[model samples]
Target: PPKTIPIVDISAFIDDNASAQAKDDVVKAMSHACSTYGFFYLVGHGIPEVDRQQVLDCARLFASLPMDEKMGISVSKCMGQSFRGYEPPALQLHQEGLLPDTKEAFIFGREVPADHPDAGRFSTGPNQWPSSLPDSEFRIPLLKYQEKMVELVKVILKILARGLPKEWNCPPDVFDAATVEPSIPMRLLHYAPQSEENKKQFGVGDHTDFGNVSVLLQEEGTVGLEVWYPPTETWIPVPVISGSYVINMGDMMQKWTAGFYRSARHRVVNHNKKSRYSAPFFLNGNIDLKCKALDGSGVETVIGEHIRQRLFETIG
Candidate 1:
């Protein structure tokens, strides 16, 4: 069987002039996508084209920097437990024996003050910026993009809430903590063209995202993403659709909905001669809040703990 994912136009949800029924149609589409594919292409998400291009350009600039300069502020050095900095290829091995991910990435999280109470806490602190790139060129635009992604994800959460079963009593506010003081992290990734010996390895291993929802920006004309199609027991390519962001549910969201939604597993394999680039923003709720299963299954867990364990399992 051929594999396919849904494409959803969210303009109605973001447009003030859109009719109520139009927004309802988007909500229904989101509900189905979440429950089934757990992934979808989102258009009309209200982010300006210029902003998107700027962010992508910034990633290109950083990725083009000298390796020595890029490693100067590696996560191993500056980030400590915060885990917000650069990671070189082979540093993160998703599966044993396979060559480590052939991708180099920069990670950023909420910027906390040095004197703040939560300073240096898990995935919470100022981001380590590249010294080779100016903040105006690199940091500012990336932060702006992150801000826009946060707003977009909040809108998605609200729509998901409205689509939930009435008896679930899952208020939209249940996702409020995710919008403020969020554990969200944004990643800028560059998958370099692999050598003949490394071509068989993956750019990133097959794994589900660890947060609530993820918004990914893919470069045009580049293809590497593939998601597992359960029914077919095969991996299907996720084509790059110009001007659309790929949104996928995560493990936390699947558990929160009591398995109503799925956290689909996906991987990247960059076989193109040119490099591939993608930016993914992960949305995780505040550390203090407990995410409870909505189906009265009585399962409850802390978001921070859940993420910490996943991190350890992945890298440790």
Candidate 2:
């Protein structure tokens, strides 16, 4: 096969009246795309057009706010027993090893009430919102969009599990329990125009996600994301399609399957002479969930602890 990223349409698999052959073909294409590219563009996901647009519009609005205003909801100020809030731009790796990204970000999770059961727990609690901004702008629409993301992620992983080898005994519904309160970290990022020193640098350097799976939305005209094809050592530009989400397996997914599935190495570059905005949701299962290596190597991991540590290294 050629070195390129694949786009997979998942409508048939989700359709109630679809034929067996139609559903079967959907998973086969999904399986091939997941195994080979580690990255794929997903279309026909059931999320509504208005829901998607409102989220991106909210992100664009927040990214344009003054620094002090955004900083009012800053990560340090807002991390009330959980990970949430805005991160101002800096000239360092958003993470440690990746190129010092030129992106500033607003990170949050499901907006649970302060009195919610998980409120005091780590990484699974309430979110911080820009108090000065209209609730409809950031808090309301962003929160609404996250609910849909959770639904879509369930459908995606379930379908993907169907594509796994039969010997694995990986049921499509296996992930459902753990995901009930999954550690879904949603990030809205804004990359400043490229600087001379970082012209060749990345908005985010090549790296794989640390969760089970991820769903990303990029601005329609923006381009800078590239997914690596390890076999050919090629980097293919990821094209943006309105209302479509970029899907990728995470390192945890790879480890759980003992590397049978890939956590694609990808990066972003905002060198296109304009601001770049994108949203990535990391569908990390419940922090305390244990994932056993499906290949029978006797390896097991506590997902929450693993992802918590990665956050320390990945985020400033």
Candidate 3:
């Protein structure tokens, strides 16, 4: 059997009626989970179930559109330097001519006006939306989902600050300033059911996320996500827990923590006959903000440049 990561209840930190000890306990559990699995199920994140369902419904609606309509808003067609738009399956050509991951995704970021000074900068531009999708279908629900994820990430950062070693000197607001006007990229993913011949192919290749944190909203009754466990040298299934988001640390967070927390590698393999859907909110810092290493052992660089470097390596 695959090992299970920790499941934490974080309502105490956000709830006024909770005791300080409750918050402290949540912090401790999170710290352990970050160190070991770098992944966990986050429950009690106050986002309403109705809101979550609405977002999921919206994603399904968008994905159900004809291929031609989806292609019209494709990333290759509308996105420039920011790479914000839709991507078709097998579109991401991996190095050495390997089989591409089998999934379609709609990507979006903080909508910057074309006239903004940094509008031309990588990851700073308006998103491309399907002209056919109504505002209520694509824009509204997704924006609401993004808002909830932002709030949840802040709470998680606070918990990390409280749990990290005193020597690390990580302020509770360490991640706040960078995120004030962030370049948060979100993706709505759809994985079609695989045939017998393509069963070994991946929906997404194994890799760690490039940003600070990733909050994943997975569809229930679908299984494919897997996290690598180094100790056993095997991949373990990440089961979807009802009413919860799967939170995982990313490369930037690992770097900031000076290796205290891991950025685990994970992937998706959709073998189920039914299609699978998931939304991942990549919580990152503002493009130009420079973050200091918590251990004070490394030089600082603009977070945006780092993100660009990683993205170019993968998708270029």
Candidate 4:
């Protein structure tokens, strides 16, 4: 994790007339990280720190509400999906003696209609609004944060385009509006409070993300996120770089890239007693677009149906 995590500068890619050397440098760094660790830290990304801090503040404020208040907008009511509300640790990690995942999360996304029973249960539907919370203070900042993340996702999509071969061109309208409506999903995670008891019983267990790409902001003073190194079969801590968002490729990215890239395994250990907050934005594919395996990418790929179907099953 320490030796291989690459740091890429977004300014290079955003440059309209980037020099050849600059572009190649960025590409080489990206390819190495994508093929090797499949995760990296991003610097010079230009995402406003103020906006990020605002999101953190909002998340903390929302989480501070009473348990009954939090449950008022439970995920179950949001179209029979589990997208909203708090998730207890080990629920997603252990099923039948599986490794216990050591984290908990509160998920949110833009609301959609409940008609598409086939769509991802928690995805592409209306979100559970916190009725008791003051809308004027909370709603405005939440929406603003959501919109900004959406814009950033588009920026990442362009980089994904560069990673694809000509045959797999990035569609100009891939991020465009569609009838089904696309959503940028956010999971406000609270790592288990670090303590002797919780260390023995709670905190996130081992797991891989299910989406394409994720932008994560770890708490200022915490150490729990770790990635599995397949070749060595070892876990390593993700180095904390100040002011950098830890970026990683996920299952969908691995599938879409025809396995040239990897979906790395990651987990969070107990945060040693301090409460930690992580805001992760999942940049997902267009809701209505179907995923098709590459014709001759040499590696097997998961079709859009396989990806979308599984998400519906898990998030449902």
- Compared with the true structure, all predictions reach lDDT values of 0.81, 0.78, 0.80, 0.65
lDDT of 3 by residue, 262-299 (tens): 99999987666767778888887787888878887886
lDDT tens digits, residue span 216-303, model 2 = 9888766788888877788888878776899999978877778877888899866656666788888888878888877667898888
Q: Which scores better on TM-score, 2 or 3?
A: 3
Distance from true location, Cα of 244 in model 2, Å: 1.9
Q: Please give, for residues 9-58, the per-residue lDDT of candidate 1 as tens digits.
A: 98987888999899889989988988878899999998988998887887
Can you write out model 4's per-residue Cα lDDT over 1-316, one digit (the tens) per residue?
A: 2544778887777658878788767767776787788888887677788877777776676666665555566565555543655554443332211123355456777756556564444356666667766776566777788777776666766665565555765553442332124545787766545444433433555667766778888768756678888888887777678778888887776776677677888877664555667799876655545555432555533334545665667552
What stretches of model 4 exceed 4 Å from their correct place?
A: 1-4, 15-17, 86-104, 113-122, 165-180, 198-202, 294-304, 308-316
Q: What are the C-alpha RMSDs, in order, of all predicted structures?
A: 3.8, 4.1, 4.0, 5.4
Instruction: State the local distance difference test value for candidate 4.
Output: 0.65
Candidate 2's TM-score:
0.89
**Predicted structure 2: lDDT:** 0.78
Error of 4 at 38 (Å): 1.1
User: What's the TM-score of each model vs. the native?
Assistant: 0.92, 0.89, 0.92, 0.81
